[PDB]
From a paper:
GerQ is a spore coat protein known for its importance in spore germination in B. subtilis and B. cereus. GerQ has been reported to function by recruiting CwlJ, a protein responsible for hydrolyzing the cortex peptidoglycan surrounding dormant spores and essential for Ca2+-DPA induced spore germination. GerQ assembles into a structurally stable architecture consisting of rings containing nine subunits, which stacks to form filaments.
In this study, we re-process the previous cryo-EM data and successfully determine the structure of these 8 nm filaments at a resolution of 3.3 Å. The GerQ filament exhibits an overall structure characterized by stacked layers, with each layer composed of nine GerQ subunits that form a bowl-like shape. Within each layer, the nine GerQ subunits are related to each other with C9 point group symmetry. It comprises two α-helixes, five β-strands, and connecting loops that link these secondary structures. The bowl-like structure formed by the nine subunits features a wide opening (∼39 Å) on one side and a narrow opening (~17 Å) on the other side. Each interface is formed by two adjacent GerQ subunits, where β-strands from both GerQ subunits create a continuous antiparallel β-sheet. In contrast to the tightly packed bowl-like structure, the interactions between two adjacent layers in the GerQ filament are relatively weak.
Author numbering:
A (entry chain J), B (entry chain H), C (entry chain G), D (entry chain F), E (entry chain E), F (entry chain D), ...: 91 to 169
Write the structure that this text describes.
């Protein structure tokens, strides 16, 4: 388990590469996509991106953590 | 009890891992989830996340402290 | 009585642990709780939280001082 | 009378502890209390608070100077 | 007359203590007092306040220069 | 004529003390005076004020350069 | 695969020059193009631009990463 | 032609003193002049002003570059 | 081709002096020109301007890169 | 009284062992204790320390003279 | 008691091996630990280290005196 | 009058023991006392201290000459 | 146990070759690694390096003592 | 006239005791007096002080040459 | 193994010519390369340089030890 | 012409007493005069001062060479 | 190959006169050229300069080693 | 060609008196001239100055080598 001094969002996202996650993300000023729900499998997350790979259709998204609001897992968040 | 110089929000959240908490959180600009009420059991809280594990359905949320507004406990806040 | 150089909000809140206080707090952008009135007994206040313990129902709130607007006491503010 | 280099708002508020003052204060984003008029007797003012003690009902307010707009005295501002 | 390097607003306000001035001031976000016109006699002005003493009723205001918009004199601005 | 390194707004305003100027100024958030047109004779301009002396009625304004938008002269801008 | 300390958005965009990408981008304040969907082939991406070359019509866009919201790939994000 | 390290807006405006220019300028928050079109002859431009001298009526404007949006020339921009 | 450390927007704009470009630009707060489409030939681009020379009518615009949103080329972006 | 050649800070601090002193001390770069006010009774002061013994709670501090700013006595500085 | 010529910080720290001390230490430029409070029992202190042995968990720290700010004892500083 | 070779600050401060002086002093990095104005009667000044004895309240300060900026006398500086 | 005259940091680090240590180190000016936590087994420490050999993955670090802040042991610091 | 080897600032300041001088001085880190303009008559200047005696009000300043920036005379600098 | 008196950084770097090393280096004040990760094979290291020869592309870097922060080896640091 | 061993700044400034010079000087930390342009006639320059005598108004400046940045002559620098 | 006692940066730069080098250099405080990439052929390097002769355009730079950060060769560093 | 022991910057600048040079110089803390580009003909360079004589307008600059960053020649650096 990570200590206090490095338990940031990106480190935990990198500890759970392969967990079915649904990311609730909200882009500040839009008219067509004001709030988005990216469901899929986290393939890899850097400190400015969360590469989500939806297996239903195969579209590997590339989100930006700046607009992230909250990630809902389903099995076990390994911290 | 923590001294004055380190009694921040995250330290107290880390002192009460295992207390039934309902977090009232508000995302700044959304159309679908402007205000959310995350009820559950705090499993672990870093300095940029609060891993809430709802036991009713099993969805382990991963919130962001930036959008936090206030946490309502029910038993005893250990500070 | 505190000198000028350390008479901040949190220090006074820490000098009155146990006074019936009603905190008028306002969250910036919400649709459901735009303004809240947290009534109760101040149990302990750090520099980023005000643990209010309502004795009517037992829900020990944990507010954030950032959103604080003003605290109405009823007996004696000890400064 | 204070010199130029220390004639700030809080210093003058501390020079007039005991003057009937009506503070016109405005909280930025509220729906229920957008503008408030706190009338009473200034008991003590630090650099982040103005402890106003209304003698009509006895509720000793604790305002925040950040939201202050202007203070109307009635007898003599001692500067 | 002040040189260029110290001809700020507060210095001139301090050079004209005793001139009938009408201060047009505007508080950013209010519903009841969005724009105010404080008419009176400038008694003393520091670097964060302008103590205006209306002689019609005797209410010695204490404004904040941050919200100042413009001061209309009537006789002679001594700079 | 001023060099490049000191040709700011206030320096030029100080080079034309005595020119009939109409200052188009706009206060950010007001309900009664959102845009103002101060016509008159520039008596003296510091780095935070433009003392305009209207000769029609004699009211010597004292504007703030922060809210300035643009100054329309009529004879000759001496730079 | 990039380490943690250089896994930014632009580096990954530069690792996938030649992948069919649809960039969902949103310009903050517009009336005609508030949200745009730039579909095409990423030719080259610096740290302030993403040169997308649509092959349907031949218009080689030049976007700005500041307004980027999220990039949807279709085959394989190489990180 | 100016090098890269000093090819700013004001330098070019100073290289074309005497070219018929129409400056499209927009003041942020106004009710009466939200967008203005200053047509005329550029007499001299410092780093915080663009002295435009309309020859049709003789009103020598003095704009502020902060509110500038774009300048439409008609003959030749000398850079 | 430019390296990573100097591949900014202005450098590329300077590498393609002479390419038919249509710049989609948006001024933040306007009522008459909220979004503009400047079509023409890029003559020269500094780090705060993009001198576009429309050959249809001859009006050599002088835009500001701050308000730039995205540039659509038509032939070949040389990076 | 000490001569000129040995009247340093530490010598005088050693001549007044037993005087109620409030030391205003400031640590250069801190986020939690940027300025501290150590009130108490000076028990002994070497050339790199000032052992202050607060009698209110009994915590015998051990400050460092390097960070000292100024000592306020209350009765008589014996030099 | 030590004479004047050798009463430095390290000598006194070596005279009190075994006193419950809380060292308030501040590292100059950090983002995660800008100010630290090392509580424990001083086991041994050289001239460049203060081996603090916390008995609560058993982690024997090894601090550096360069970053020391001030040590708060609780029983008796033997000098 | 002192010769050139010994006319330092401390010597003159020692020649005027008993003159009402207001010392304008500035501590380098503070949040609460960045600039202080110590008014009083100079009782004695060594080469690292200026014992100022305010007679209004009786608090005999002990400043440090390192942080001194300038001393304003009122009657006669004897040099 | 080392005497006073040679009890420096490097000597003690050399007396404990083989103790599980977590070194909290902070590099002065970085954007990606401002604070690092090197956990492992100290293999050998000279006077300008601390060869830490993490056994989890096998990466034998080579730190620099200049940037060291503090070393947390876990079993016994032999001095 | 002084030779090259002793024509320092203090020597010239001592050659012009009695010349109306305005000293432009700047204290490094202040919030209230960042730049000061001491106007008056130079009474005597040592090698660490410039005793300026303003005759308008009678306050005989005592500046420090370390913070000096430049002295503007008005009649004749005798060197 | 080197003795204590010559176990510096450069000597050890010279004892491991031919070990795959990743040097984490940070240049103090840059906008484009604030932190760099030079991965490769150490060919030779003097006392002011570390000639790293990346075999992936063949670019033989020449770093400066002054900016070095820490070197991560992978096989065996021979000291 | 001076040899190599004595061709310093002050010697050349002393060889051109009487040349119209504009000294571009910059004081390190100021809010009102961060950069100054002293235009005039060099009357005499020692090794710590440059007595510039502006003939337009008669104010004989006395600059300090420490803050000098560069001197622009107009006729002939005699070296 | 140079021995240990003279293997400095300048000696090696002088051993490779004629190797295509790209010098990554960073000037401490600039607004226009904060980081520069000088690509070319090293013609000659003294102990305070590196005469780089770019053959693309013919501009023979003359850098300063003080601001050097790191030199990337491409063929063979001869040490 | 100069030997190693005297190949400094000033010696080479003195070997090329008469070469068209553009000196890129940067003054540390300025608001108006943070970076300057002095183009011209080097007339003579001592060890603390570089007398550049621009022939376009005739202003013979006198720079200071301390602020020098790098000199770009155009024909041949004779070393």
């Amino acid at each position: 388990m990570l200590p206090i001094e490095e338990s940031y969002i990106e480190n935990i996202l990198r500890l759970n590469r392969g967990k079915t996650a649904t990311i609730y993300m909200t882009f500040e000023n839009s008219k067509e996509w004001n709030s988005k729900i990216f469901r899929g499998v986290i393939e890899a997350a850097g400190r400015d991106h969360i590469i989500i790979s939806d297996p239903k259709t195969g579209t590997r998204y590339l989100l930006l953590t700046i607009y992230l609001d909250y990630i809902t897992f389903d099995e076990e968040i390994a911290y």
